[PDB]
Amino acid sequence: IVGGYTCGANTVPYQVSLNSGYHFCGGSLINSQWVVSAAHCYKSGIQVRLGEDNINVVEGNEQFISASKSIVHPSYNSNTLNNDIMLIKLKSAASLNSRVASISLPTSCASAGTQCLISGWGNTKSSGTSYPDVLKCLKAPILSDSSCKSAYPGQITSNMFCAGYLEGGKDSCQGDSGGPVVCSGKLQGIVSWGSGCAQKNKPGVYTKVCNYVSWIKQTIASN
Numbered sequence: 001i002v003g004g005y006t007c008g009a010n011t012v013p014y015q016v017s018l019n020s021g022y023h024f025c026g027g028s029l030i031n032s033q034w035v036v037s038a039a040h041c042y043k044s045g046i047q048v049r050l051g052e053d054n055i056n057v058v059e060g061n062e063q064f065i066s067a068s069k070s071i072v073h074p075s076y077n078s079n080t081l082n083n084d085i086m087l088i089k090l091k092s093a094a095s096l097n098s099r100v101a102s103i104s105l106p107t108s109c110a111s112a113g114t115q116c117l118i119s120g121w122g123n124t125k126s127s128g129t130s131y132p133d134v135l136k137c138l139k140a141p142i143l144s145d146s147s148c149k150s151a152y153p154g155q156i157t158s159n160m161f162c163a164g165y166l167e168g169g170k171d172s173c174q175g176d177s178g179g180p181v182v183c184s185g186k187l188q189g190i191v192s193w194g195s196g197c198a199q200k201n202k203p204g205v206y207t208k209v210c211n212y213v214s215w216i217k218q219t220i221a222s223n
């Protein structure tokens with residue numbers, strides 16, 4: 001997250017870190033057994049880390065649970081990032097508590113102009129590289145479809161939305177991928193892509209989670 005703030009330990013209790021020997025992507029806990037992340041975060045051999053603040057210090061509220069299964073969306077296209085969503089099943093259910101908690105899936109799609117909370121352990125620099133150890137947060141508004149398509153002509157599908165600031169300076173970034181965009185208390189987006197981070201006229205692009213609720217629900221009813 002570039003231009004964000006330190007969230008505060010365990011104030012984003014649905015945020016997970018996906019670990020394959022190192023943090024590589026975020027995700028969102030949607031119930032005690034399942035995480036939503038980005039399909040482009042797929043790796044074999046994923047451990048889900050819940051209850052994290054500093055991902056490099058065991059502070060005492062973590063749960064580390066291996067994935068048993070990952071399910072990339074059936075229509076994921078890694079070239080365009082259309083349908084950039086994945087489900088990860090935990091080997092064992094998380095113990096839900098004040099620090100480890102699920103986020104609701106949406107009923108309705110979020111509205112342009114809504115300010116959402118985006119969070120992660122990704123890079124904090126637009127030019128260059130610095131990865132934080134503690135979780136960072138950003139409030140960013142959803143942009144209109146027309147503005148999103150202007151920013152990325154021929155690239156935006158109906159399964160994506162933009163959020164952020166066209167002046168630059170505030171955005172998600174590498175290593176935030178797969179993490180949550182929460183709007184009105186529901187998971188509305190997944191950190192997916194963008195041109196660089198926090199560059200002028202190049203806002204973040206997010207997987208539109210409200211288009212996937214029926215897939216998510218049928219898949220978790222079946223696995």
Ligand SMILES: [Ca+2]
Binds near residue numbers: 053057
């Ligand atoms: Ca930790």
